[PDB]
Amino acid sequence: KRLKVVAAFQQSGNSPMGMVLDAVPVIPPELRPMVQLDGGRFATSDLNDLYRRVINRNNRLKRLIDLGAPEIIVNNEKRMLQESVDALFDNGRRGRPVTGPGNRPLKSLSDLLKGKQGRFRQNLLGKVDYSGRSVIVVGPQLKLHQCGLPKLMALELFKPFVMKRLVDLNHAQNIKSAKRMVERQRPQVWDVLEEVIAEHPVLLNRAPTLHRLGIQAFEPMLVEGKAIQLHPLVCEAFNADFDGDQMAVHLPLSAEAQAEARILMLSSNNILSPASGRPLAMPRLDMVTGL
Amino acid sequence: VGSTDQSGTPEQSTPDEVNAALDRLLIADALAQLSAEHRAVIQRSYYRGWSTAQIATDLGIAEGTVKSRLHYAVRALRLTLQELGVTR
Amino acid sequence: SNNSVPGAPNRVSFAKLREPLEVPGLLDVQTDSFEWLIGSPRWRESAAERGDVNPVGGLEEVLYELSPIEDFSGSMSLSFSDPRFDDVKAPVDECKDKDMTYAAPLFVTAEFINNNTGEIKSQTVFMGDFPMMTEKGTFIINGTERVVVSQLVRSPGVYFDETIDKSTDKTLHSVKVIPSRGAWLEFDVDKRDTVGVRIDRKRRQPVTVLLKALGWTSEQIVERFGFSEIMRSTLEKDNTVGTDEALLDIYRKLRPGEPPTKESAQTLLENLFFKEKRYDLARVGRYKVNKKLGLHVGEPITSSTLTEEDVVATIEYLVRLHEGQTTMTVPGGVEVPVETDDIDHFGNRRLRTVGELIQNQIRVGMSRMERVVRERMTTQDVEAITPQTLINIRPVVAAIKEFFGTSQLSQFMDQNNPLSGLTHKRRLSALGPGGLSRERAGLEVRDVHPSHYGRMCPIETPEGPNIGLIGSLSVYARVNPFGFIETPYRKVVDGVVSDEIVYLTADEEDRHVVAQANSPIDADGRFVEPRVLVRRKAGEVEYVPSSEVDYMDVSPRQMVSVATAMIPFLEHDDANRALMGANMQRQAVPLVRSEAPLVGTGMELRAAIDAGDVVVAEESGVIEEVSADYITVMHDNGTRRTYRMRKFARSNHGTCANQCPIVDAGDRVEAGQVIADGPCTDDGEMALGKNLLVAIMPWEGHNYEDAIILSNRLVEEDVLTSIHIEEHEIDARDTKLGAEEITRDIPNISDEVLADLDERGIVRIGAEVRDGDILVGKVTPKGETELTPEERLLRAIFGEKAREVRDTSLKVPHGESGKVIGIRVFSREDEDELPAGVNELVRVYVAQKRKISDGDKLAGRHGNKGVIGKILPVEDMPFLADGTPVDIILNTHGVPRRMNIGQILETHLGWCAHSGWKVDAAKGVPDWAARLPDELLEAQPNAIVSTPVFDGAQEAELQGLLSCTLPNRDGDVLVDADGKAMLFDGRSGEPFPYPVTVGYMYIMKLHHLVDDKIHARSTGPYSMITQQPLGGKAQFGGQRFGEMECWAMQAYGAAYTLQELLTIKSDDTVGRVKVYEAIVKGENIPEPGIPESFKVLLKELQSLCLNVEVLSSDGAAIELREGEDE
Amino acid sequence: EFIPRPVKSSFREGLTVLEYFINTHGARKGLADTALRTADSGYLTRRLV
Amino acid sequence: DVNFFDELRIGLATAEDIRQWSYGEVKKPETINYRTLKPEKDGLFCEKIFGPTRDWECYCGKYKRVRFKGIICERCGVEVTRAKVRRERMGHIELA
Amino acid sequence: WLSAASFQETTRVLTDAAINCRSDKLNGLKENVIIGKLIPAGTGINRYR
DNA sequence: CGTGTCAGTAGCTGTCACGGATGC
DNA sequence: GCATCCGTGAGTCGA
Ligand SMILES: CO[C@H]1CCO[C@@]2(C)Oc3c(C)c(O)c4c(c3C2=O)C2=NC3(CCN(CCn5c([N+](=O)[O-])cnc5C)CC3)NC2=C(NC(=O)[C@H](C)CCC[C@H](C)[C@H](O)[C@@H](C)[C@@H](O)[C@@H](C)[C@H](OC(C)=O)[C@@H]1C)C4=O
C-alpha cells in the first residue's frame, strides 16, 4: 500500500509538496453569498466565517512574527492557523467541529459535495422548467394512450406555444400582448390551446420511480377540473392508488424528445413488464370481476 | 444573526428573462426596418453607451448630425412599435 | 342516554356497562402544569386538599434554590422572595392582532444582606414580562398561538443494562446514573472481568481509582467487594494506589492542562457530585434511587443530592448482577431484587409538562443572572449597592424568549379543527432536548409497551418518520407531580367491585393484577366467572381466580385517546386503518354548516366542549340580548356577562373559525351549558363531516380502487362547501435611493387594473380578486445605472421620463381567488412600531368559498380515504325505489382487504338512525333486544345514537334492528333485513340486477384539496447560486427530475429527452432563453450547452486545492469564458 | 414470537380490549419496520444501478 | 462553447497555481459596510479582487457608465465588467 | 473518478484522484449526465445519432 | 482607552453493521 | 502479531 501511494508521485510528475500549502484559495463570493434579512440584520454563509477565522489567525501570526513574541505564543498560534485551515476544508474531520451559534457545526467546503445534499447528488444527478403536478383521478372513458389534464395546467405548460398561436391568428397584436392575454386568461386562449396540445405527448411520473414504467408518455386531453385523469390500466405500473397521491407532468420540447415520447415511452407501446415479460396493463380489480 | 447553511433562511432567486427577451426580439424587429445610418447610430448611443461627440468622432459626421439621427430614429422605432401594438 | 350532565342533545347509547368515573378535564395537562409553575390560587387549594404542607410553586422553587447569592468571603448576600404578577399587558385578541406576546409583568422582592455593616435594603424588583397561558391552554408568541407539548424523557435515577458482547459472546452489564442536572457517571463491566467507570464521557478509569479518590483504604475495598473475584482482579490490575494519587489521576483525566493540586481535585470531586450547585437529583430522581437500591426507603425525601453510600451501593448492585445474583440488601437497607431496567417502561420513562419545561429555562436564565450578580458585587462599592444595581434581567428574559423562540416543545397547535387543537395540546413526544434524536431511535422506542395501557394511546400516532415517537395521552390519564402518568382503577376488596377509585402509576400497576373493563359483574359486585381475563406484569394476559383480582379498569375506552375514542365500532377495525381514521379526523375541514353524525360514540360532546372552540355559559341565567355579534346573559344575582362571537376568523392553517349563537332571546340556560358553538360543532358535539347516503357497489369504473363518486347535490346544496382564508402581507421600506411608497399611481398600468383600488393603492373591501390582480400598489425607486441597454432605449423611444421607480406591487398568487374581507394598515407615521427601516405595512385577508371538486380528498372515521374521481349529475346517480338518489358511491373491492368492517356496520346502523325502528312489543321483548336499553326499542327518524368504543351495538342487535326499520312516507320499506336495497341505474333506467347495501355514513372533508395541490410552471425564478428552478408551489418553482427518474430515462434509452431535461430546461443560462425565443419564433429547439452547476462544481473543487481541468481531444486545456491572473 | 394466547374473536364479532391492545403491537411494528426496509431496498437498488 | 471535450483532468493544486488563479489577496477580515452595503477594500467581498457588485459600477463611483468598458479604475482598483465575474474570480490568502 | 465521486465516499475518491492525477475520459452514462452530453445509450449512440 | 483580591462549557449515548487501518 | 477503534453507510416526492 505504501508503494501504491509513492509510485503515483513518482510516475505522475507532480511533487508531493502540494500536500503542504503556502496559500489557500478563496471561492468566489457569489458561491458563499451574504443576504440581507427583512428585519434589517444580515445572514451569511458559513464559509465566510471559516475564511474570516483563517484570516484573523493569520494576521495575528503576522503580528507575532513582527513583534518577536516568545516562541510559545507563535507556535500556539501556528497550531490554531492549522486548525482553522482544517476547518475551512473539512470541519469536524479531526476532533470536535467548529460550532456556530447554537452548537451547530459549520459547513465546510468539502460539505458542499458530500452525501445526498452535496453538489453531485442534489444539483447534478438530479435537477426543471415546463413541468407541473396535481392529484390523479381515474378516467375509465380514456383510451390507453390518452391522459386527461386540467385546462389551467395545460395553459401554463404550453404558454409560449399558445402565445405564438395567439399572435399568428391575430388574436393578439404582438407577442407581448399575447403573454398578457395568457396571463389574464382571455376567452380566446381556450380555443387556441386545443389546437396546440394536438398530438403533442406529455410525460406522467409518480414517485418513487422504481422501474422505467414509472414514467410514461400519454396524449393529453383537455379536461375540466383541476385533477389529472389517469388510465385505469397503467395504475399497476405506477403502483398508484387514488387516495390523494399526485403525479408530475413534463412537456418534451425538441422534436427528438417528442419522438422518444411517441415511440419509446408511449403507454400503449409498453404493455409488458420489462422484468418478467408478463403483461401489466390488464384487468386487475373491477375489470377482472366484471369479466 | 443568520447563516445561509442554517435552515429557516430563504434562498436567493433571480427572475426569468421572458419579458426582457420578448422586448429584445421586438426591438430587433423594429431595428431591422431602419436605415443603416440610424441603426448604426442608435446601436452606438444605447447599446454601446457612447457620448454624442464620441459617435460624431467615430462616424466622421457632425455633432448635430448625430443629434438629429438619434431624434428621428427614436421616433421611427416608436412608429414601428405602435404599428405593432406595443404598449406605451 | 349518553352524557346527561351539561344539557346536550339526547344521544341514546347502546351501553351495557355503567360509567363509574366521568371523563376528567381534557385540558388539565396544559392547565395544571402552568398553574403550579406560577403558583395560582387554584393550584394552591388543590395541593392543600391533596394533603401537602407548605407547598411551593415552580417560580418560588427556583427562587428558593437560587437564594442566597454570596461571594467567597460572605460579606455580601442577595436574596429573592414573594413572586407576584400584575395584570396582563394586553388582551388575547389584541396580541393576535398587533403581533405581540401575551404576557404579565413579574414582580419579586429582593434584598441585600451586608454582614460587615449590619444593614439591609429590601425593595421590589421587576423581573420581566412573563408569557402567560390562555384559558385554552395555549401561549401567544408574536401574535401566533403556540402549544407547549409534554415531553417524554428518561427519568432521573440509576439504571442497569444487560448487554451481549460482540467478540467474546459473554453477558456484560452496565450501569448509568442519570441526574436531573449535572455531570454523568456510568459504571460498567467489560469483557475482561474488570470493573470500570466513565466520569462525564471522559476516559474509563478503574472503579478502584474512584474508590481510592474518595478516601477509602485498599483494605476496606477488599472487605466490601471480597465475595466476587472480578473485584479482586480489578483491585489487583489497578495501576496507582493512594488517596492523594487516584484523586490527581481523576483530576488529570477530567480537567487536563491544569496543575493538579490535592485540594483543587478535592474541591471539584465534591462540587461535581455532592454539592447542590453543580449536581442535583430531583425529588423524583432521589426517590427512584432510594427505591432501586433499597436504602432510605422510609426517610422523608430531604436529600436533593447524590451521596457516597449510593455510589458504593451501585457498584455492589452491579457486581452482584454480573455473576447471576438476584437479590441484594445494602448494609443498612431494605431487600431489593437485582435485575436490569427497561428504560422504556413508563415507570422509568418520565413525562415533563409545560411548567417544568418553562422552569428549567427560568433556572438557566437565573444562573446566568447570578453570575452577573456575583461579578457586580465585587466591582461596585459595598454601600451604594441596591437590588436594582446587582440585577441585570437581560439573560432571563432572553432565555424565556429563546425557549418560546428557538425551542423544541413550543409548536403552533394544529388549528385545522377543534379536535386537532385538543389533540395537539394532549400530545406526548419523545423528540427534543434531553430526549433523543430521530437518527438515535431504534424500532424499540417506537412500538407499543404494555405499561402504556390507560396512559398513552396505542393507536393515535403518525405513520411517517415520527411513528412511535409521538403519542397521545389516554382519556382518563393524568400526570402526578413526579412526572409519571397515573391511570384510575376501581379497587376490588375481596372479589367485589367497589366504587372507590384510585390512580396508579406504572410500577404501582405492575405490583397488582387488574381485570378487564368488560367483566361480567354481579349487581352487588362479585365476578360471575371464577376465572377472568386479567393483565399481569410483563404484559401477560390470562385467566385467574376471582379472589385474586385487586383492581379493574374504569371504562372500556380507558386505553384509547380522545380522537381514537370517536371511532364508532372501533373494535371491528384493524389497528392500521384505525390509526389512519384517528389521524384523519384531525385533518377535517370546518364546513359552512355543520351536521352532527347520526352514528356517534358519546365522546363528541366532551371533545367539543373541552376543546375550547365553543361558548359555554360560566354562570346560570337568562339570555338578555342575542345577536350574531355577541350574547348577553343576565345572571340570577343581577350581574351581566357578555360573550363575543368570533366571526370569520382565519383559523391558523387557513380554515374558518366561525362561532354562531344557539340560544334565543329569553332562554333559561344553566351554568356550563353551550350557548354558542364554533367550527365543526353542532349543538355542542364535534361535527367533523356530513351524513351521506352511501351505496357499496362498483359504478362504471369511476370509483375504481379508492376513487369516490359523489352526487352533484353536495355541490348544489353546499353540503361539502368550506370557507378558506389566506393572509397576504407587504411592506414599504427605506431603500438606498429613497423609500418605497404605497400608491395608486403605478407606472404603465391602465385605469382598469387599478379600478379595484382605493386612493391609497389598496384593494377595497368586498372586491373579488383573481390571480394576478393587484392587492397593494407599491413602487420602488431604481437607479439609472441599473438599466438594461434595451430598457434604456425603450424608455427613450416612449418619452416617459421621471419613471425612476419600478413596480413591486403585492399581487395575488397563482391558484388564489376570493373576496377581500379585511385590510389592516400599520404606518410608522401613525405611531405604529414597525421594524427599523419599514415605513408602512399592509395585510389583506382574502376569503374563498371552496365547493367540493374532483380530486378533493374525502375520508371516513375508519381509515377509508379517497379522492373524488367523478361528480355525476343528480339524475345519473343510482336512486332508490322512491326516487331519492344516493349521495356517494364507494367501491366494494376496497372494503374486505383493509379489515375495516366498521364502515359497513356504521352504514347499517346509520340507515336505522335515518329511518327509525320499532321492536315488536307483543308477546314479550324479542330475544335479541333483551340486552338493549328500553330507550332503544323505539326510534324516530333522524335519531342520534352512541356506540362507545369496545362497547355499544353488537351485531345481533344490529341485525335485529335492520328487520324492523320504519317505512317511508308511502309506507314502503326500502332496505331489506340483510341491509341491502334495490337500486335503479339512473343512466339507462333498468334496475340493478342485485340488491346493494345502502345506508348513511359520516364522511369528512380532509384538508387536501386540488385547489392547493395543483401547480404548473413554464419558466420562472431560478436559485441564484445553482441557476436551477426554484422549489415548492409558493415560490412558483418546478418539479425535481430526481436520480431515479434519470435512471428511468436511461432505461428507456431516451438520451435526447434526458439531456433536454438536465440542460436547457434547467440550469443552462444561455440555452433556456434561446429555447424560449425559438419557441416564440417558431424555430427549432437549439443545441444544449454546458450546465452552470458543473461550472460551480469545478470552481468548488478548485477551492479545495484540486487542480481540475477540461482537456480537448488533442490534450490542450480549455477555459470556460474566464482566465487567471496573479 | 407469537403470544401464547391468541385472539379468538373475529373482526366481525368484535375484539375485546386486551385482544385489540395485543394486536396493536404487531400492527405498529409492521408499519414501523417498513420504512427502514424500503430504505435498505432503495440503497441496494442505487448500488445495483 | 461546444459540448465535446474528451478528458477531464484532476490533480494537486500547487501554491503557485493558487496564486495564478487569484485576482488578489484577501488581507482584511471584514466583509462589507453595514450602512452603504459597499464591500470593504481587501475584504472577503473586495470589488478590486472579485469584481463589481453592480454591472459597470466601480467602488469609488467614478465609472458608472458602459462606455468605460474594461478600464481599471485608478482610485479604487476595480475593473468594470458585469457582476457575473463574481461567480468565477478566485481569491487567495497568503499564509505566514 | 467523476462517476465514483458522485456515488459514495466523495473525499476518499477525490484525494486518490488528485494524488494519482487521474484523467477521466468523459464516456459514460453518469458522466455525460453530469456534463450535459447525450448518454452513450439508446438514441445517443453514434449508430443512431 | 485601561484592565489587576473568589472569579472556570453545555451537553450528553437511547443508532448499528461492517471493514480495515491504527495501536499495546 | 491481533484486539481496538475509527469512519462509513442507512427510500423518494410533497403543500
Ligand atoms: C416547533 O415545532 C416543530 C417541532 C420541532 O422539532 C422536533 C424534533 O420536536 C417535535 C415534537 C415535540 C413534535 O410533537 C412533533 C415534531 C417534532 C420535531 O420534529 C414533528 N416533526 C415533523 C415531521 C418531519 N417534518 C417533515 C420534514 N419536512 C421538512 N424538513 O425540513 O425536514 C420540510 N417539510 C417537511 C415535511 C415535519 C414535522 N412532524 C412532527 C409532528 N407531527 C405529527 O407527527 C402528527 C402526525 C401530525 C402533525 C400535526 C401538525 C401538522 C403540527 O402540530 C403543526 C401545526 C406544527 O405544530 C409543527 C409543524 C411544528 O412547527 C412549528 C414551527 O410550530 C413542529 C412540530 C410533531 O408532533
PDB file of C-alpha atoms in Angstrom, chain C residues 1012-1072:
ATOM      1  CA  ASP C1012     -53.961  23.993  -3.302  1.00  0.00           C
ATOM      2  CA  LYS C1013     -52.147  20.961  -4.732  1.00  0.00           C
ATOM      3  CA  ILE C1014     -52.335  21.831  -8.447  1.00  0.00           C
ATOM      4  CA  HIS C1015     -49.231  23.543  -9.816  1.00  0.00           C
ATOM      5  CA  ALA C1016     -47.564  24.158 -13.169  1.00  0.00           C
ATOM      6  CA  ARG C1017     -44.664  26.229 -14.464  1.00  0.00           C
ATOM      7  CA  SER C1018     -43.309  27.159 -17.892  1.00  0.00           C
ATOM      8  CA  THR C1019     -40.485  29.405 -16.643  1.00  0.00           C
ATOM      9  CA  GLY C1020     -39.899  31.445 -13.505  1.00  0.00           C
ATOM     10  CA  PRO C1021     -37.395  32.217 -10.756  1.00  0.00           C
ATOM     11  CA  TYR C1022     -34.074  30.395 -10.534  1.00  0.00           C
ATOM     12  CA  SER C1023     -31.881  29.846  -7.487  1.00  0.00           C
ATOM     13  CA  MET C1024     -29.118  32.441  -7.592  1.00  0.00           C
ATOM     14  CA  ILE C1025     -26.268  30.061  -6.743  1.00  0.00           C
ATOM     15  CA  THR C1026     -27.086  26.937  -8.766  1.00  0.00           C
ATOM     16  CA  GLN C1027     -29.160  28.669 -11.504  1.00  0.00           C
ATOM     17  CA  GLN C1028     -31.735  25.872 -11.253  1.00  0.00           C
ATOM     18  CA  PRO C1029     -35.502  26.454 -10.998  1.00  0.00           C
ATOM     19  CA  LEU C1030     -36.912  27.123  -7.545  1.00  0.00           C
ATOM     20  CA  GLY C1031     -38.755  24.569  -5.446  1.00  0.00           C
ATOM     21  CA  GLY C1032     -42.237  24.485  -3.957  1.00  0.00           C
ATOM     22  CA  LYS C1033     -45.518  25.842  -5.295  1.00  0.00           C
ATOM     23  CA  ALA C1034     -45.394  29.065  -3.261  1.00  0.00           C
ATOM     24  CA  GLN C1035     -42.127  30.070  -4.966  1.00  0.00           C
ATOM     25  CA  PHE C1036     -43.562  29.210  -8.427  1.00  0.00           C
ATOM     26  CA  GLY C1037     -40.900  26.522  -8.773  1.00  0.00           C
ATOM     27  CA  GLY C1038     -40.653  23.481 -10.999  1.00  0.00           C
ATOM     28  CA  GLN C1039     -40.675  19.746 -10.408  1.00  0.00           C
ATOM     29  CA  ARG C1040     -37.498  17.883  -9.472  1.00  0.00           C
ATOM     30  CA  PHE C1041     -36.367  15.287 -12.013  1.00  0.00           C
ATOM     31  CA  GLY C1042     -34.509  13.208  -9.469  1.00  0.00           C
ATOM     32  CA  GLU C1043     -31.911  10.481  -9.741  1.00  0.00           C
ATOM     33  CA  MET C1044     -34.372   7.597 -10.100  1.00  0.00           C
ATOM     34  CA  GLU C1045     -36.170   9.461 -12.889  1.00  0.00           C
ATOM     35  CA  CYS C1046     -32.840   9.815 -14.695  1.00  0.00           C
ATOM     36  CA  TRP C1047     -32.396   6.058 -14.306  1.00  0.00           C
ATOM     37  CA  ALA C1048     -35.836   5.628 -15.886  1.00  0.00           C
ATOM     38  CA  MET C1049     -34.887   7.838 -18.844  1.00  0.00           C
ATOM     39  CA  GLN C1050     -31.644   5.903 -19.327  1.00  0.00           C
ATOM     40  CA  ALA C1051     -33.511   2.584 -19.154  1.00  0.00           C
ATOM     41  CA  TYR C1052     -35.775   3.821 -21.947  1.00  0.00           C
ATOM     42  CA  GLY C1053     -32.722   4.991 -23.882  1.00  0.00           C
ATOM     43  CA  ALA C1054     -34.296   8.462 -24.184  1.00  0.00           C
ATOM     44  CA  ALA C1055     -30.948  10.224 -24.469  1.00  0.00           C
ATOM     45  CA  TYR C1056     -32.292  13.418 -26.032  1.00  0.00           C
ATOM     46  CA  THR C1057     -35.145  13.804 -23.533  1.00  0.00           C
ATOM     47  CA  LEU C1058     -32.749  13.359 -20.609  1.00  0.00           C
ATOM     48  CA  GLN C1059     -30.219  15.846 -21.993  1.00  0.00           C
ATOM     49  CA  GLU C1060     -33.054  18.306 -22.651  1.00  0.00           C
ATOM     50  CA  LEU C1061     -34.271  17.890 -19.069  1.00  0.00           C
ATOM     51  CA  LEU C1062     -30.851  18.420 -17.481  1.00  0.00           C
ATOM     52  CA  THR C1063     -29.713  21.336 -19.670  1.00  0.00           C
ATOM     53  CA  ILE C1064     -31.968  23.808 -21.492  1.00  0.00           C
ATOM     54  CA  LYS C1065     -34.949  23.102 -19.216  1.00  0.00           C
ATOM     55  CA  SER C1066     -32.938  23.533 -16.000  1.00  0.00           C
ATOM     56  CA  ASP C1067     -29.597  25.265 -15.422  1.00  0.00           C
ATOM     57  CA  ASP C1068     -28.367  26.254 -18.901  1.00  0.00           C
ATOM     58  CA  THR C1069     -28.062  30.021 -18.520  1.00  0.00           C
ATOM     59  CA  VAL C1070     -27.988  30.833 -22.243  1.00  0.00           C
ATOM     60  CA  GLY C1071     -29.812  27.737 -23.502  1.00  0.00           C
ATOM     61  CA  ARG C1072     -33.121  28.377 -21.741  1.00  0.00           C
TER      62      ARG C1072
END
